[PDB]
Design a protein around this ligand. Structure first.
Ligand SMILES: CN1CCN(c2cnc3cc(C(F)(F)F)cc(-c4cccc(O)c4)c3n2)CC1
Length: 288
């Protein structure tokens, strides 16, 4: 039970445009979409917009709630077609605060590409990669470092638009099996992050490379037989993930660039969009 009467009335005024009235949102607590460490996600309907609603169970304090509000306002103004949007936040006199997010029909991108009901083409796969690159170009422009880029942390909507997710108020550990313990996604991490536990846009690029390998393999696990404690040495020896069977040569060249051991020699996300755009354009799709 969070004491809403204690919130500063001026902060409450400043946050209003992120705020969703309890009266405008039905949460279907019956219908669980999924869960992370920080909370369960439920189907909801927003005044009718099908949405995903996440109950942030580790907000207890009034101080915490006030930070949450300010974070919501900040994150609400992020806006790009390949970055997950924050629809709003909802505070309740009982229960944890709620984060309202668009519903993503096709779930996470790793599960989609592993699903036997769908058969994306090589072009579709490259296209997913390009879309992540565009969304990351946007985040990097805002000086926002993801720190956990991976196919499992991108979502797919009904139009097969990819949205970079798992950041801001949606940040969580949703599948613990890919993190080693401070839980680290070691098989996605840049060589220097393994050594220092610091992350930058240049380390996001490295992870993006691994993501592109996940895409082109249709969701193979990276380095499954290299132990967590051996991966730094493996990478120091210059060894990398092998070219996927259906990955075009220039696209594997792009991946190797992303895994350069000198962070400063990796491409920018702008250069990735450029390079992947070109490679994408060499494939004929259904209508163009
Ligand atoms: C059967 N599938 C039907 C679509 N599914 C959807 C649809 N939209 C989601 C939106 C979000 C968002 F971040 F926006 F809150 C989050 C999830 C999601 C949340 C936790 C685990 C997970 O794996 C997925 C969504 N999961 C999954 C299950």
């Amino acid at each position: 039970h969070i004491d809403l009467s204690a919130l500063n009335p001026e902060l409450v005024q400043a946050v209003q445009h992120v705020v969703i009235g309890p009266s405008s949102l039905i949460v279907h607590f019956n219908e669980v979409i999924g869960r992370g460490h920080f909370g369960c996600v439920y189907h909801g309907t927003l005044l009718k917009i099908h949405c995903a609603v996440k109950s942030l169970n580790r907000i207890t304090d009034i101080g915490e709630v006030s930070q949450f509000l300010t974070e919501g306002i900040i994150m609400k103004d992020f806006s790009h077609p390949n970055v997950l949007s924050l629809l709003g936040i909802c505070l309740r006199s009982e229960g944890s605060p709620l984060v309202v997010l668009p519903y993503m029909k096709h779930g996470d991108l790793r599960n989609f590409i592993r699903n036997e009901t769908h058969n994306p083409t090589v072009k579709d796969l490259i296209g997913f990669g390009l879309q992540v690159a565009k969304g990351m170009k946007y985040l990097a422009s805002k000086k926002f470092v993801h720190r956990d880029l991976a196919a499992r942390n991108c979502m797919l909507d009904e139009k097969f638009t990819v949205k970079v997710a798992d950041f801001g108020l949606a940040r969580d550990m949703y599948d613990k099996e890919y993190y080693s313990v401070a839980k680290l996604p070691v098989k996605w991490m840049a060589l220097e992050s393994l050594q220092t536990q610091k992350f930058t846009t240049k380390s996001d690029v490295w992870s993006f490379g691994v993501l592109l390998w996940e895409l082109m393999t249709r969701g193979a696990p990276p380095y499954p037989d290299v132990n967590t404690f051996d991966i730094t040495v493996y990478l120091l020896q210059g060894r990398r993930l092998l070219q996927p069977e259906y990955c075009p040569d220039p696209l594997y060249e792009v991946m190797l660039k992303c895994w350069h051991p000198k962070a400063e020699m990796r491409p920018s996300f702008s250069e990735l969009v450029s390079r992947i755009s070109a490679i994408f354009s060499t494939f004929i799709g259904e209508h163009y």
